[PDB]
Design a protein around this ligand. Structure first.
Ligand code: DPF
Ligand code: DPF
Ligand code: CO
Ligand code: CO
Ligand code: CO
Ligand code: CO
Lengths: 323, 321
């Protein structure tokens, strides 16, 4: 009874192979509840999510961390249903993403701290489900509100021991501004993951954050566009280029600071209409891309099996553990 | 028949109707995720029930809650308060000033499907159908706001359900809204140009009323630090109320819709705004029948005209045609 999941508290050993940055549905607050037909139906979305996590479990995955926040349309009741049906542990998230509504964006740091603490200590909505991770975001230079979210995330993390994970515009080196704000609040670097870090080839930026104790979120491995709307989100860099960054950080002695994931989803309303149809053709493996296509690739390049097992099992366990 | 949060009602059951009100001004999913922001869900229900009972004792029989999906409309809350207070509440579809990513990236065809499902099928999984479409512009319409107005027009034309708007009246938004609605084939009699009491430009108001539009003089009690005087304004309630008399004197009594634009919870603004609002207007939703109606009677407006504005006009507006 260490890590909080959508099914209740589980132990460190029960976690196993863990994908640290995933989504069941990328949406907006109240959207799935108000317009389920957008995704065909709520039943069609549940079935697509259950089939996907079952194929991921058959490939080796035992736990996924759903980093969808309130404004990313997190519906913990959906997460609970798909978790139970697929028999895969799902860790829920609190925090705020890139689309906070007026009722969230006009709040103070004290109020946001109360909201984050409520979702971790009491529960999310009326479900009783407690969050086991805090997700925050910046897209370049932090807005005055985003600074308050990062400070509230840090204050909520120090009071509960629950980790913090971030969304970044990696090419603009956001991890450094996020890191500076977290440390100004007294938050330990070992409790933070700088996500979307595989969107850049700047190894100097990655190794420096890793040297301070930060976990590097190399979470968008299958995202490649090799269509203006699809190119702007997937990027023009291959999956191999993103995957070689895992090898590059191991070679420099930072195997303990790596967190790998797919940043996959089954429903996607916070982008263009038929993006889910384009995404499932680029990567038909889905969340099963890390154990099926990325792990045997790194084995062919010379990376040992024990260090890859240390990145997928030991690192997320230490990260998700309340300390 | 008009759809309410408790089901369909006849034109006669509507009675004295306030056409632009809110039980709670919030954001989508907010009340469900953070009810303690309002003290508790129970505290918000209790405040709303007492406020609606005060409105009922003053003569109000129906309120039109113009809160949209993005304004945090919770029809289950509206249903609970309507039952306890014995006041009919008409719910709304449409989009307000804060659409999230999943809404702002949608096409006109997709938004039309959404507005239609809330009117024809129901809101969420509640079975409660919307009886009005709420839209918004804050100055010149953004490309997205133009799509919302067109989708609102298409939803209205397929159902007969009316359209009510939010405007930046000082910038004369009603003229552009009118042009967009008319380009879609929407009859002016199915549209209310709201927040029209935010301007003293009578020429702009009469020009729209002459074309057949309903003029929403909906923020009568809104009068005044920085955050307070920003939305409230420097003009008195009497100046806002005299716009009702000014339009009757020009022969447009049938084109007037009056309301308070009140709320019992407000999270989509600064923290203790509710404490500021409750002292500016202690009457709440009872402001229109308790203060505005006797004021207009003192100025020479007949009771038959006032009953025409508060009972006849809203009934004709809400009735699907
Ligand atoms: C996946 C949907 O959310 P996101 O990770 O912010 O999108 C960019 C990868
Ligand atoms: C919640 C009410 O929002 P609004 O009617 O746009 O503004 C009221 C002054
Ligand atoms: Co992200
Ligand atoms: Co993500
Ligand atoms: Co308005
Ligand atoms: Co309003």
């Amino acid at each position: 009874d260490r890590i909080n999941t959508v099914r209740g508290p589980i132990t460190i050993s029960e976690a196993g192979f863990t994908l640290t940055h995933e989504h069941i549905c990328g949406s907006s607050a109240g959207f799935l509840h108000a317009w389920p037909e957008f995704f065909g139906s709520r039943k069609a979305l549940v079935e697509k999510a259950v089939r996907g996590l079952r194929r991921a479990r058959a490939a080796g995955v035992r736990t996924i961390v759903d980093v969808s926040t309130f404004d990313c349309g997190r519906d913990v009741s959906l997460l609970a249903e798909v978790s139970r049906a697929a028999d895969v542990h799902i860790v829920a998230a609190t925090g705020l993403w890139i689309d906070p509504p007026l009722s969230m964006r006009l709040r103070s740091v004290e109020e946001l701290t109360q909201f984050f603490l409520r979702e971790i200590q009491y529960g999310i909505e009326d479900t009783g489900i407690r969050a086991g991770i805090i997700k925050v975001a910046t897209t370049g230079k932090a807005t005055p509100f985003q600074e308050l979210v990062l400070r509230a995330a840090a204050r909520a993390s120090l009071a509960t021991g629950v980790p913090v994970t971030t969304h970044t515009a990696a090419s603009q080196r956001d991890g450094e501004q996020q890191a500076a704000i977290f440390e100004s609040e007294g938050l330990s670097p070992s409790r933070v993951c700088i996500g979307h870090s595989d969107d850049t080839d700047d190894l100097s930026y990655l190794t420096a954050l890793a040297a301070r104790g930060y976990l590097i979120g190399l979470d968008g491995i299958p995202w490649s566009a090799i269509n203006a709307s699809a190119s702007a989100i997937l990027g023009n860099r291959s999956w191999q280029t993103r995957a070689l960054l895992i090898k590059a950080l191991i070679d420099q002695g930072y195997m303990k600071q790596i967190l790998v994931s797919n940043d996959w989803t089954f429903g996607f309303s916070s982008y263009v209409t038929n993006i889910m149809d384009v995404l499932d053709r680029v990567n038909p493996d889905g969340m099963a891309f890390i154990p099926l296509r990325v792990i045997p690739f790194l084995r062919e390049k010379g990376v040992p099996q024990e260090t890859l097992a240390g990145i997928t099992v030991t690192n997320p366990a230490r990260f998700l553990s309340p300390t």
